Write a protein that binds this DNA or RNA. Structure first.
Ligand SMILES: [Mg+2]
Ligand SMILES: [Mg+2]
Ligand SMILES: [Mg+2]
Ligand SMILES: [Mg+2]
Ligand SMILES: [Mg+2]
Ligand SMILES: [Mg+2]
Ligand SMILES: [Mg+2]
Ligand SMILES: [Mg+2]
Ligand SMILES: [Mg+2]
Ligand SMILES: [Mg+2]
Ligand SMILES: [Mg+2]
Ligand SMILES: [Mg+2]
Ligand SMILES: [Mg+2]
Ligand SMILES: [Mg+2]
Ligand SMILES: [Mg+2]
Ligand SMILES: [Mg+2]
Ligand SMILES: [Mg+2]
Ligand SMILES: [Mg+2]
Ligand SMILES: [Mg+2]
Ligand SMILES: [Mg+2]
Ligand SMILES: [Mg+2]
Ligand SMILES: [Zn+2]
Lengths: 138, 104, 156, 131, 208
RNA sequence: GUAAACUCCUGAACCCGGGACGAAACCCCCGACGAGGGGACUGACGGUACCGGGGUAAUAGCGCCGGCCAACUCCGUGCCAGCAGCCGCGGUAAUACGGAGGGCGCGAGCGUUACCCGGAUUCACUGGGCGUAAAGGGCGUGUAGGCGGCCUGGGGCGUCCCAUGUGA
RNA sequence: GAGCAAACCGGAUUAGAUACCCGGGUAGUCCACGCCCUAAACGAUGCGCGCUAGGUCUCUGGGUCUCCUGGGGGCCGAAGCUAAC
């Protein structure tokens, strides 16, 4: 039994990418599905599409990387070099609007969860709201 | 405006009096984790109408003794031993920590 | 084209080994070479004589350089990098801030041609891995993340 | 530790331990010398080092090193203690100031002075600048 | 009482030519002329690769010794700067260059700063009319810095302006040699100043 | 070390004369006892600050100079006398003791001692740990508590936002 | 209460042996109930859960059965980790 539904996903994407898999599956759910909507509009992952496996819903996240490199260790740079969880369970981290994070000096987002859908540091600030700081990706 | 608080009676032993439990909830001054603490307030039952485990609301008022300074406006659910059982069960514990020495 | 920079010796040491009879020192120099225009590289070769030790490291230096993405006079953005036990962390700063960092990271950053930074340190303040420490930092700064997230991917 | 641990049973602040048992803070002490012995050094160094017990105003009978190339302290002298430990003398953790009370500054010294209470010389003994 | 005493040894310690005397430090005699090595019994020996601290230090004693200010008045302005909007660097200089005792140097009224320090002291200068014997007085943009009426007749001063007849002035100042007056147009910008300094280092020194 | 000498220029102190802001009303008169207007007394600080004239070159010290920490030789002394914040320095070549010269620092101040914060991500929320370095409770059962999968709908306590009062 | 064996009894070795060696010997080791609760009680590595190359040997159930799928024990090793091991 999972303890933190999201964190699970984030990680499942994290390791997934470290071994360069083409895409990984993760338990479906509105939220996660809305959380991946961002990683997708933002370029960290080609995309996700509702899929079934054994009979239970899952989400196929098609990871995105870069080009192969020159010299030793030719593996492709990472698109999601880092993807942490901020607001863990039993640690709820909600930030005001003036408390929203800047994240990797604009090189990365920070998915918030404001009472106005799931937005990113940008949007959320643009709309003028704050809320549970779900994660930080770069 | 007089503050209203919503809690759960937990003892009707006294006359015209009811012990209400107010659970509050706030993030840490230095850890932001959410937290729950509680306080027992002593409000007046001039009608003896409120009984065990009734979920009531409370208001500030003319002190009516050492500790009692609130009242019981009106109901919010006429029955829930569910929570009273928790408090009663917390105390039950103390009764057993240190001294008695179950080891002797 | 041209392959000449400015060299700076970070920290030298005698190392001493042991054998029947006595001891035997081996010298270690830690050098940084740079353009002040974006290229810099650490290097530490050993030798029975400091000079060669420096020269060698002068050669190892120039071979391990890293074009640093400088914006104006700073690092484009933030980065903290783990090494042995060292945790250098650099933070981009406004102009007129100054370098502001340790003997080592400064020796390095100052050749990459920086002018304004604020550095984060938190372990094994060891001249060596803090040295390396400041470099992968400089190797991880981003050029084109802007491109990688939105460009296609054909032949990978 | 879990943050919900840091919550119940938080973090214990670091208490300090004064390496200078000179009551109520106080920067200097007034004591009455008692025995002015000559303790030896320790592991690495060697010689004879002037030192002297001092019945302190606060009530403590503490030892004190006697700086300088030579001094005039005896069995009843009143002295001022500073503070600072010597590393070759276990037990003492305090110094004796000079040119203060029965404690007189060493003669002829010429650089220390402020340290080692010792009114500089007159040099040819004229105004602030002649000689 | 800031310093006061041998100067050229200062010139010799920083290794760069400092104008702390006005005249002379131009003709073959500022010492840095055939003897640029530091003073002391080892000025000629060989110097060892300086410590990051040494450089930052030397570079400060330079910036400062050029204006002859106590490390005290020196610091506090540094701070003023640090706090003001703008490039700590130049903002620092700006102010440093805003000192009456200094402005009196740039306007020529005196052969060099120290002398200007003095002229200000003995009340031979004026700002907006009311004389000012304060060296550290900060000249603001738009303040005439004239010569004391009862001083316009001193030989020493006449001598000075007499030779200014021709010497242009910083594009951040301007003077009227006739009425021996001169305004402080605006805070001179780093460029405008030709200092053999690296304030990006002074700065670094006070970051320790 | 242009340091002094010496030359010239300026002239803090000190002397002369002048010397005030801080003070305007309460009272009295006209007016109406209003409003307004008129009159007059009123200083501790002070004869002080400040202005005008004359005017002499007219206090400097203190800490350090092995490494951190910028500053080096010689003479003395010889594990002695003594230095010491840590590391240490001294047993007959001491850049680490003492004096000299020199030098760096700061300057009416400079050193010292004590205590608070910093460095100390050395109590770590931001920002740490526990195979062998200090650190997993000998194991389990289970109470308070902390934490909790998937879908929709009510509340909307938390949470976020706008207004406003408070935040002297 | 067979054997063994603290303490203890002798034997021998030693410069001296209240020891290593040797011959006996009590508590004890054994069982019952009650008490003690410690341990290099060590994998010196809390419990649960999800995720991340393989290969090789082995115990145990299913299997279209010398191949694949589940549980447990070892070995070697991807990425990764580690101050190193
Ligand atoms: Mg509560
Ligand atoms: Mg009461
Ligand atoms: Mg680490
Ligand atoms: Mg740092
Ligand atoms: Mg005392
Ligand atoms: Mg004297
Ligand atoms: Mg004199
Ligand atoms: Mg001066
Ligand atoms: Mg200097
Ligand atoms: Mg001058
Ligand atoms: Mg005259
Ligand atoms: Mg701290
Ligand atoms: Mg630790
Ligand atoms: Mg839920
Ligand atoms: Mg609400
Ligand atoms: Mg028997
Ligand atoms: Mg251990
Ligand atoms: Mg089957
Ligand atoms: Mg297995
Ligand atoms: Mg292995
Ligand atoms: Mg590997
Ligand atoms: Zn000169």
């Amino acid at each position: 039994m999972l303890t933190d539904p999201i964190a699970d996903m984030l990680t499942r994407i994290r390791n997934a990418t470290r071994v360069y898999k083409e895409s990984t599956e993760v338990p479906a759910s509105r939220f996660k599905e809305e959380i991946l909507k961002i990683l997708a509009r933002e370029g960290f992952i080609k995309g996700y599409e509702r899929v079934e496996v054994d009979g239970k819903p899952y989400l196929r996240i098609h990871l995105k990387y870069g080009p192969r490199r020159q010299g030793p260790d030719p593996r492709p740079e990472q698109v999601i070099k880092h993807i942490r969880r901020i607001s863990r369970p039993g640690r709820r981290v909600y930030v005001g609007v003036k408390e929203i994070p800047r994240v990797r000096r604009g090189l990365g987002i920070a998915i918030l969860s404001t009472p106005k859908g799931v937005l990113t540091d940008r949007e959320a600030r643009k709309l003028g709201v704050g809320g549970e700081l779900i994660c930080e990706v770069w | 405006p007089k503050k209203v608080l919503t809690g759960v009676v937990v003892s009707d032993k006294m006359q015209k009096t009811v012990t209400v439990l107010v659970e509050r909830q706030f993030p840490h001054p230095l850890y932001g984790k959410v937290i729950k603490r509680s306080k027992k307030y002593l409000a007046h039952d001039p009608e003896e109408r409120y009984k065990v485990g009734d979920v009531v609301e409370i208001i500030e008022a003319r002190p009516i003794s050492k500790r009692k300074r609130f009242r019981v406006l009106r109901l919010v659910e006429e029955g829930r031993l569910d929570l009273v059982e928790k408090y009663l069960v917390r105390r039950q514990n103390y009764a057993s920590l240190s001294k008695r020495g179950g080891k002797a | 084209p041209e392959t000449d920079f400015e060299e700076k010796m970070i920290l030298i040491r005698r190392t001493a080994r042991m054998q029947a009879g006595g001891r035997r020192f081996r010298f270690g120099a830690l050098v940084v070479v740079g353009d002040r225009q974006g290229r810099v590289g650490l290097g530490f070769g050993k030798a029975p004589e400091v000079p060669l030790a420096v020269q060698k490291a002068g050669y190892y230096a120039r071979r391990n350089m890293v074009e640093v993405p400088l914006q104006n006079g700073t690092i484009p953005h933030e980065i903290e990098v783990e090494f042995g036990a060292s945790k250098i962390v650099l933070k981009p700063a406004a102009p007129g801030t100054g370098v502001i960092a340790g003997a080592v990271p400064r020796a390095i950053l100052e050749l990459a041609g920086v002018t304004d930074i604020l550095t984060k340190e938190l372990g094994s303040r060891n001249p060596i891995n803090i040295a390396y420490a400041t470099m992968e930092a400089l190797r991880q700064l981003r050029t084109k993340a802007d491109v990688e997230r939105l460009r296609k991917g054909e032949a990978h | 530790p879990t943050i919900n641990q840091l919550v119940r049973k938080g973090r214990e602040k670091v208490r300090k331990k004064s390496k200078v048992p000179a009551l109520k803070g106080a920067p200097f002490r007034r004591g009455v010398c008692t025995v002015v012995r000559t303790v030896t050094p320790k592991k690495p160094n060697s010689a004879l080092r002037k030192v002297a017990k001092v019945r302190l105003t606060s009530g403590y009978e503490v030892t004190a090193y006697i700086p300088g190339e030579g001094h005039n302290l005896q069995e009843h002298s009143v002295v001022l203690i500073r503070g600072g430990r010597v590393k070759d003398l276990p037990g003492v953790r305090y110094h004796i100031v000079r040119g203060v009370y029965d404690a007189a500054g060493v003669k002829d010294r010429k650089k220390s002075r402020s340290k080692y209470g010792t009114k500089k010389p007159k040099e040819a003994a004229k105004t602030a600048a002649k000689k | 009482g800031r310093y006061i005493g041998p100067v050229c040894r200062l010139c010799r310690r920083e290794g760069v030519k400092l104008y702390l005397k006005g005249e002379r430090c131009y003709s073959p005699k500022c010492a840095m002329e055939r003897r640029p090595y530091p003073p002391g019994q080892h000025g000629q020996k060989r110097a060892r690769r300086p410590s990051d601290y040494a450089v930052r230090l030397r570079e400060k004693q330079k910036l400062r010794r050029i204006y002859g200010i106590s490390e005290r008045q020196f610091r506090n302005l540094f701070e003023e700067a640090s706090k003001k909007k703008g490039v700590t660097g130049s903002v620092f200089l700006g102010l440093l260059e805003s000192r009456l005792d200094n402005v009196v140097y740039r306007l020529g009224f005196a052969v060099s700063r120290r002398q200007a320090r003095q002229l200000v002291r003995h009340g031979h200068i004026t700002v907006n009319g009311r004389r000012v014997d304060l060296p550290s007085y900060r000249v603001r943009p738009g303040d005439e810095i004239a010569v004391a009426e009862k001083s316009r007749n001193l030989e020493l001063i006449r001598q000075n302006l007499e030779a200014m007849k021709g010497r242009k002035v910083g594009p951040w100042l301007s003077l009227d040699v006739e009425g021996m007056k001169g305004k402080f147009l605006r805070l001179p910008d780093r460029e405008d100043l030709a200092l053999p300094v690296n304030e990006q280092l002074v700065i670094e020194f006070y970051s320790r």
